[PDB]
Design an enzyme around this catalytic site. Structure first.
Site, short mmCIF file in Angstrom:
data_model
loop_
_atom_site.label_atom_id
_atom_site.label_comp_id
_atom_site.label_asym_id
_atom_site.label_seq_id
_atom_site.Cartn_x
_atom_site.Cartn_y
_atom_site.Cartn_z
N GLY A 96 0.78 -1.24 0.00
CA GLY A 96 0.00 0.00 0.00
C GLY A 96 0.82 1.30 0.00
O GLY A 96 0.86 1.99 -1.04
N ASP A 97 1.51 1.62 1.11
CA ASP A 97 2.16 2.94 1.25
C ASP A 97 3.67 2.94 1.07
O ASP A 97 4.32 3.96 1.35
CB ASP A 97 1.87 3.55 2.62
CG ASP A 97 0.43 4.08 2.73
OD1 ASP A 97 -0.16 4.45 1.69
OD2 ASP A 97 -0.11 4.18 3.87
MG LIG Z 1 -0.45 2.44 -2.90
MG LIG Z 2 -1.42 4.76 -0.21
MG LIG Z 3 -2.18 5.45 3.26
#
Ligand SMILES: [Mg+2]
Ligand SMILES: [Mg+2]
Ligand SMILES: [Mg+2]
Ligand SMILES: [Ca+2]
Ligand SMILES: [Ca+2]
Lengths: 152, 153
Positions: free
Chosen positions: A18-19
């Site tokens: 994700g991040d």
């Molecule tokens: Mg992402």
């Molecule tokens: Mg993200």
């Molecule tokens: Mg995030």
DNA sequence: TTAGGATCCTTCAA
DNA sequence: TCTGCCTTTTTTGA
DNA sequence: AAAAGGCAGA
DNA sequence: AGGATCCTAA
């Protein structure tokens, strides 16, 4: 080389997909043998409000640091040997950034031999291009073709 | 039907949701509802449409919900109350950044029957919506428990 | 020379 | 009335 | 990401 | 998120 808990690696792999960012760079620099250096970085970004979550990563990973840019903060791991150990354990659980992680490992393993031959250094630069192609790259400048002017 | 989700799936997905996901509660003005507003609860995962395969797979894995494209990105969406409650129940233990919102969503879902029964109860659940928006990085919210508060009819 | 760190920008993909 | 979907917009938080 | 809204059948 | 560029101890 820390061995990390499986349930932590499972959750972290999701969080990273994700991040997170697995980044490989060629940087021009006149002091280096082939006039360029390779840089490899594992990074996780979060709004500085949740920097605490990054400070916890530092402690859980055991290596790396957190840098605050104002609006956002980044967990950063660059040191080659800990990076190799960390990604080795993380990679099996990654689904979106698994290829970038494995390309990083392959590059690290070839670093010694890369400093001894420009043909080998170039080839390794091509794996860096591959990582960039897998990322959503948008501001890249230096590529293996930039290096290919070792054609002097 | 109350699908049972597997541990390693929930762990990875909890991570991924803490990253790119969103747990959203809204109060939507709507004159044809009992108290002139509808409560809507959504679990959402966003990703660039080139990676829509990952979201489509989430439909298969969670077994409900759907994917929508919108500009250059796609979203998995689950809003159906009973499966959403079942899913968040099992996901919540592993969430780190979005655990509180998930638990507020559950609390809200459990009260919905009796929210339709008193304005004062409807208002209180609305304050739980407020708390979820507070926890999120809210930036374009319009309808709040205060909007609901008239209702001073 | 080399490796890691410091600092900042660019453009979205959330 | 209700509830499952749909469809777009805003502003970052990556 | 995290909202804002709309439509239609039961 | 995914780069860019400068700096300096080792
Ligand atoms: Mg992402
Ligand atoms: Mg993200
Ligand atoms: Mg995030
Ligand atoms: Ca790409
Ligand atoms: Ca907030």
């Amino acid at each position: 080389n820390t061995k990390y808990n499986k349930e932590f690696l499972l959750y972290l792999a999701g969080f990273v997909d994700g991040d997170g960012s697995i980044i490989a760079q060629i940087e021009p620099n006149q002091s280096y043998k082939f006039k360029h250096r390779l840089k490899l970085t594992f990074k996780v970004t979060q709004k500085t409000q949740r920097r605490w979550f990054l400070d916890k990563l530092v402690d859980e990973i055991g290596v790396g640091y957190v840098s605050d840019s104002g609006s956002v903060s980044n967990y950063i791991l660059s040191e080659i040997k800990p990076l190799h150990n960390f990604l080795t354990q993380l990679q099996p659980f990654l689904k979106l950034k698994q290829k970038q992680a494995n390309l990083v490992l392959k590059i690290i393993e070839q670093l010694p031999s890369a400093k001894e031959s420009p043909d080998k250094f170039l080839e390794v630069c091509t794996w860096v291009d591959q990582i960039a192609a897998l990322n959503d790259s948008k501001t890249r400048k230096t590529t293996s073709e930039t290096v290919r002017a070792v054609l002097d």
